[PDB]
RNA sequence: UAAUUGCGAUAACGAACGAGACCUUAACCUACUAAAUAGUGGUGCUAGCAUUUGCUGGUUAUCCACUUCUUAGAGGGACUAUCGGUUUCAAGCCGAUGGAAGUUUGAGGCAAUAACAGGUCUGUGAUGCCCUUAGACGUUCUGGGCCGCACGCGCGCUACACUGACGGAGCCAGCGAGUCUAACCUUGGCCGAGAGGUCUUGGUAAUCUUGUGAAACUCCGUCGUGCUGGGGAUAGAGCAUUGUAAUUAUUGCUCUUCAACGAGGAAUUCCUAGUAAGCGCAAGUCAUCAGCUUGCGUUGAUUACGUCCCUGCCCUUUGUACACACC
């Protein structure tokens, strides 16, 4: 009855879009995984191969519908966490943006993703349904 | 009708309006504020006058400015000042009264803006008002 | 002659001192920290708090 | 018990608390009688809390740190090790799981259980170098208590298989049952045998 | 790692056998309980969680609340 | 007649506050049309020094502030108007600017 | 920009200020307007020093060619009196006295140096009332801190006055602490 | 270890080299009619309830 | 700390020594007749002022003061 | 997780590329036991492998052990990147290498020998025996025992 | 009492500077003033879901009004207010209530009569005397040096691990800084694994970076209790920018060894509530580099609400052959 993806917040979302993406067959992977750490402040990449480019375009196409459009940029700053820089004090530093542009560019190359006049991209019409799909079946499965 | 509230840094301001039992936080329903231990915290200026009590009004609000915990203890301030503000100005001045009663025998600076303020950090020192450290002998 | 100095201490000093030393490069003053502080109240910078 | 309902989609787990005998969110809370008379006023169950976050104004004075939820006392004990500084939700996460494992083991009104075990651990009498045996406050017994599960928690879960909850949970039933192979009930002890020597 | 890293059947009745003389299993309970590892500890757990005797509490990371049935 | 954009930045509130007041009357007196004075943040040049010029002493840092105070205000006034209404704010000490 | 323009404006001020004071030191220069204690050389042969000192400002600042009671005035008079020649205690006592005649509530002249080979002393003149300090130093307070060079040794000199709050004709018209009732 | 639990009724003042024992004045709640002197570290305030081990043993002023 | 000094004391004093037909024991009253009839050129100090005033007349119906 | 009774397909420490690797931990943490091979390394080279990473070098596979054996001592021709191996141009042939064996010590021992034979001031501080990479031992490294 | 703050006692009375008072800031103000350089609601530009219409919702020149949220001007509020008790008689203090806040409301700026052989001539085109002065101790250029290592000391970051590490995953700040004589903060696309480069674009600034999409932290999994997967100390190989110049690692990046550290002796530093501590942010130095400092904010305890045991200083008394005053 009127259900958005702001009626699943943080966990079973992703876990449903992820899913949804895993079992569409469309890979959309540049071949980046096994290859990459997501980030220049890690230490070791993902601990499953399969799983992580598909969770970060769950992340980013949900965080690109519950806000604005966003850039690459954003993303990087918003993935990027910090960093064991050796004896120096721990230091914020951004993600690798390689990754983010290729998962941007494959929402972009799906469809669900389109530019905006003034910098950035937003969720499209058909991205938006699926998400709004993804969501209620997310209610209807597992509250 | 509108309320606001801080706890730290973090300002909520809340809508209340004559609607049907929605109360919001950021877009997502008091279900997934997800502090996940403050879930109930949240849910105290709401479960404390009654079970649920309300089906005629609708709260929308929106926090910013602080950390996690700070927007939580200023959305629950601010949804219950504008509960607060409803009955003074629609519901009833008694109705009003017993509720602050309620919010303020389980006082969490639910309805008074807690005033405590980081102090500005003076030089010779790392924080406020402990100095930096001397052996000298 | 002169070697290039188009940066660094070489290139920037105090406009009252000369000195390249406690250089204040904020808000376009280019004058020292000891010249600020004598002649400040001139600028328009009160002590306040 | 007559079950409202409003439009946002919200489980009856929380609806169905204070319609009945306030409690918390999942243990009995009204069922909770300090074994002693000295320690009274100095815990601070009835009123009731829902959970030990009350992050108020409570060291401008000097008794009003006393009317603080003796839960939230045990999250601040647990707050300390500069290493686990701040971080108050983590704590409270492993007080929420030594409240589940006293439930699970020998639930015996789990927060009854932990309100006897901090009086049990409350040391009676110290030593003050001048050593002369002096008596405790209820204030210092109550501190001491929680300070001393604290400790022995900590000490405990350093270098071991057991979690921080579990094992906290553990030494607060043998705190409770009155068994001296705890350490918080060992240091009362060490501080009571100064008891005869030195008065 | 220094005892009953993956076998856990020297004593394999041990794997029904475990209700009973203790009301609490946790990841630590099955190392200090001579019966498993930690390296795998969590899923065998996971199993006696998704069938048998043992019921879960919540949804519980880096920790287990499970107790038996009524 | 034009529509005009008036800025006032200066750190003495004093004459700040003259100018955009008397301004408002200046409009009114005439009867013109126009958006309330808006009272942008007033930002603080807040810079800390060393007191001493060596190295010797208790480490002991004073800051020097300069707090810049700024207003705005839109107008709709002929040209005779507008030259008018910057004739008059010559006051020593306060920055106006008009933008069309 | 707008912090950087009004800095720039403020440096600007310090230059003519330090400038004005250097080269008009002669004509008894008070603080730029300009104001000097006698306000007829200013003009002086008809404008002649005025012109010159535009253009030399001009010539500075890239701009275009058409576009008694003072703290500081006491100080460099006392000090073009020690430059020139009178007894340092003289001169003093008779800067604190002239000052307080004409009706400043309070001055306060410190010399430290050389006077004679020592280990250099500070001698002091204070008459009237003088607070020192808080806020109201800023508000009614006159301060100015002076070198004077001579042959031997440089003199540091610091006069203060606290002006007269009753006839302060803008801002508070008493003291902060001033309580008075009518009956 | 004998119990025996009592109540304050007159804080007299702070004790000790470095101030953090005190002399209390404390009445037992059973034989009521009977007040002694004891040395405690932490804050106590009025009706309040102390417990001992021993009943009659007058701790003097700790100088 | 919380003591008053001898400049709002001994002003307090002053004006309660003629303007005892005066203000009452409210210190609203106090204070707006503080602005009326003294020229207190703070509100720190006028609401010091009144706050003590308020005090001494209040202390005044339990027995006459000193000075 | 499975039916892993293996009452003879379960190894104790074992033999594998010059160095024992202990059997009861992963194949990623395990192959890092060998002198050469790192964390990220070994996962990038099982992943390439298309191994399981959840089980350990004693129950993994037989066969798939020499065979990353294999592909780590040819990085550059079995799926590896040319920027994840440790040595590109060596020292006389620019091609890229990554010495996985009881030799990348030894490659460390030429390259040392080679720096302090062609005299110069990093050759020189390495010979005698102080810190090289611009590290101060006024108060820091001073006892090294 | 923070106070020579005040009460009180009293050959004193009445006072003055300093302290207070003053100002700055951080708290509040459903009160006034005004806001597409800020924010909120009613309408068309609203694609999704649900279809009696309701939730998120873009539309930055898409209209209207408003100022509750933000901003800043006049002003208001707190003055310890009321009530009990303690109070020499009072200054004050203690509890509860109200309060926006009751430890000077929290924190600072200013801070006297004076003294130091305290530091600075190595800031000053501040300066007495001397030196130097054309093989210069003036200026300037080339290389090093301040970094150096048998050793000792201090301020610090990383640290020694399951309250943990590693991955995803949730996305929350505040002080501010920024180029019109030009290369500063950089948004959005492009390339690159990364560093970094590329097409521009916005910002002379509440507009743009920037909502600083920060960390700490929450959630979910693995790691299993090990010198290990904490630590990246230690060196090598390669990858670029800053820099006319990275050799005597500026710095960042990927790989490679995971070394000491397994909780620290006698000792010893800072600190009493948004303070300790943990965490990160911005700014000064910057052509590039923080572990430094100056401010800022997120999470937010224990103990006590005092004493002279030590340490430091003040006062008083007291001795003096000191008065250049114990050098
Ligand atoms: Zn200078």
């Given at each position: 009855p009127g259900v958005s993806v702001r009626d699943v917040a943080a966990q079973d979302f992703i876990n449903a879009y992820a899913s949804f993406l895993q079992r569409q067959g469309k890979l959309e992977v540049p071949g980046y995984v096994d290859i990459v750490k997501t980030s220049s402040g890690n230490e070791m990449p993902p601990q499953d191969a399969e799983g992580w480019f598909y969770k970060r375009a769950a992340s980013v196409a949900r965080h690109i519908y519950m806000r604005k459009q966003v850039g690459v940029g954003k993303l990087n700053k918003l993935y990027g966490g910090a960093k064991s820089r050796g004896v120096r004090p721990y230091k914020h530093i951004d993600a690798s943006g390689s990754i983010n542009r290729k998962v941007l560019q494959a929402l972009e190359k799906i469809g669900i993703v389109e530019i905006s006049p003034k910098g950035g991209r937003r969720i499209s019409e058909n991205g938006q349904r699926d998400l709004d799909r993804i969501a209620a079946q997310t209610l209807e499965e597992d509250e | 009708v509108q309320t606001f509230g801080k706890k730290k840094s973090a300002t909520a301001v809340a809508h209340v309006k004559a609607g049907k039992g929605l109360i919001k936080v950021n877009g997502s329903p008091i279900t997934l504020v997800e502090p996940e231990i403050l879930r109930f915290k949240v849910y105290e200026p709401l479960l404390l006058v009654g079970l649920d009590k309300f089906s005629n009004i609708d709260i929308r609000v929106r926090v910013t400015g602080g950390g996690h915990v700070s927007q939580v203890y200023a959305i629950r301030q601010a949804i219950a000042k504008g509960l607060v503000a409803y009955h003074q100005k629609y519901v009833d001045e008694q109705s009003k009264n017993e509720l602050k009663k309620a919010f303020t025998s389980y006082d969490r600076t639910l309805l008074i803006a807690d005033s405590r303020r980081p102090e500005p950090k003076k030089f010779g020192g790392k924080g406020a008002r402990s100095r930096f450290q001397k052996s000298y002998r | 002659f002169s070697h290039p100095r188009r940066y660094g201490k070489g290139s920037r000093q105090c406009r009252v001192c000369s000195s390249h030393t406690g250089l204040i490069r904020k808000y376009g003053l280019n004058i020292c920290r000891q010249c600020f502080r004598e002649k400040a109240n001139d600028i328009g910078f009160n002590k306040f708090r | 018990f007559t079950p409202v309902v409003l439009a946002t989609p919200i489980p009856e787990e929380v609806q169905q608390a204070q319609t009945e005998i306030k409690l918390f969110n999942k243990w009995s809370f009204e069922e909770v009688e300090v074994k002693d008379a000295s320690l009274v006023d100095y815990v601070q169950v009835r009123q009731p809390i829902f959970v030990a976050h009350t992050a108020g104004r409570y060291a401008n004075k000097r008794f009003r740190k006393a009317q603080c939820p003796i839960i939230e006392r045990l999250t601040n004990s647990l707050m300390m090790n500069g290493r686990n500084n701040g971080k108050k939700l983590k704590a409270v996460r492993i007080i929420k799981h030594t409240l589940d494992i006293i439930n699970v083991l020998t639930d015996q009104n789990p927060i009854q259980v932990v309100v006897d075990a901090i009086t049990n651990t409350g040391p009676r009498e110290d030593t003050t170098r001048v050593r002369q045996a002096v008596d405790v406050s209820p204030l210092r017994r109550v501190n001491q208590a929680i300070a001393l599960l604290t400790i022995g928690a900590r000490e405990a879960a350093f270098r071991n298989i057991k979690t921080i909850a579990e094992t906290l949970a553990e030494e607060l039933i043998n705190a409770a049952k009155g068994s001296s192979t705890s350490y918080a009930i060992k240091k009362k002890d060490e501080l009571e045998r100064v008891a005869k020597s030195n008065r | 790692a220094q005892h009953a890293v993956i076998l856990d059947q020297e004593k394999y009745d041990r794997i029904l056998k475990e209700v009973p003389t203790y009301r609490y299993v946790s990841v630590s309970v099955l190392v200090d309980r001579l019966k498993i590892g930690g390296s795998l500890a969590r899923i065998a757990l996971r199993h006696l969680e998704k069938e048998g005797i043992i019921k879960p509490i919540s949804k519980h990371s880096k920790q287990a609340i499970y107790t038996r049935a009524t | 007649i034009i529509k005009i954009r008036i800025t006032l930045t200066s750190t003495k509130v004093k004459q700040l506050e003259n100018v955009s007041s008397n301004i408002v009357k200046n409009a009114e007196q005439h009867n013109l049309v126009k958006k309330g004075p808006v009272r942008l943040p007033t930002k603080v040049l807040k810079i800390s020094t060393r007191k001493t010029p060596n190295g010797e002493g208790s480490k002991t840092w004073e800051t020097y502030e300069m707090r810049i105070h700024k207003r705005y205000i839109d107008l709709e006034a002929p040209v005779q108007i507008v030259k008018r209404i910057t004739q008059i704010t010559i006051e020593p000490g306060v920055d106006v600017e008009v933008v069309v | 920009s707008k912090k950087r323009k009004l800095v720039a404006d403020g440096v600007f001020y310090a230059e003519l200020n330090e400038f004005f004071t250097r080269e008009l030191a002669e004509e008894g220069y008070s603080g730029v307007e300009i104001r000097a204690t006698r306000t007829q050389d200013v003009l002086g042969e008809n404008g002649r020093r005025i012109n010159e000192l535009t253009l030399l400002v001009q010539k500075r600042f890239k701009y275009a060619p058409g576009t008694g009671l003072s703290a500081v005035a006491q100080a460099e008079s006392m000090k073009f009196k020690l430059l020139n020649g009178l007894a340092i205690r003289r001169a003093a006592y008779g800067v604190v006295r002239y000052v307080m005649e004409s009706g400043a509530k309070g001055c306060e002249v410190v010399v430290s140096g050389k006077l004679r080979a020592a280990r250099a002393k500070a001698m002091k003149f204070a008459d009237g009332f003088l607070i020192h300090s808080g806020q109201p130093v800023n508000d009614f307070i006159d301060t100015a801190t002076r070198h004077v060079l001579m042959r031997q040794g440089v003199l540091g000199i610091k006069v203060k006055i606290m002006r007269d709050p009753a006839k302060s004709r803008t801002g508070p018209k008493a003291l902060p602490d001033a309580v008075t009732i009518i009956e | 270890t004998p119990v025996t639990l009592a109540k304050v009724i007159k804080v007299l003042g702070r004790t000790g080299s470095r101030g953090g024992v005190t002399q209390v004045r404390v009445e037992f709640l059973?034989?009521?009619?009977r007040t002694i002197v004891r040395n405690v570290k932490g804050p106590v305030r009025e009706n309040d309830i102390l417990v001992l081990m021993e009943s009659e043993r007058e701790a003097r002023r700790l100088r | 700390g919380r003591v008053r000094t001898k400049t709002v004391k001994r002003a307090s004093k002053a004006l309660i020594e003629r303007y005892y037909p005066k203000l009452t024991l409210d210190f609203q009253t106090n204070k707006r007749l503080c602005d009326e009839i003294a020229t207190i050129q703070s509100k720190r100090l006028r609401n010091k002022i009144a706050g003590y005033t308020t005090h001494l007349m209040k202390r005044i119906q339990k027995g006459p003061v000193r000075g | 997780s499975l039916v892993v009774q293996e009452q003879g397909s379960f190894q104790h420490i074992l033999r594998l590329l010059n160095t024992n690797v202990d059997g009861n931990i992963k194949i990623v943490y395990a192959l890092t036991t060998?002198?050469?091979?790192?964390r990220r390394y070994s996962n990038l080279v099982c992943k390439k492998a298309d191994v399981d990473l959840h089980k350990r070098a004693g129950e993994l596979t037989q066969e798939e052990l020499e065979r990353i054996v294999q592909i780590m001592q040819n990085p550059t021709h079995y799926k590896i990147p040319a920027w994840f191996l440790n040595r590109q141009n060596d020292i006389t042939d620019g091609k890229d290498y990554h010495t996985l064996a009881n030799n990348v010590e030894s490659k460390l021992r030429d390259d040392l020998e080679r720096l302090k034979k062609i005299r110069a001031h990093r050759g020189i501080r390495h010979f005698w025996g102080l810190?090289?990479?611009?590290?101060?031992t006024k108060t820091t490294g001073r006892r090294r025992a």
């Open positions: - | - | - | - | - | - | - | 059973e034989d009521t009619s | - | 060998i002198k050469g091979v790192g810190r090289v990479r611009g590290q101060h």
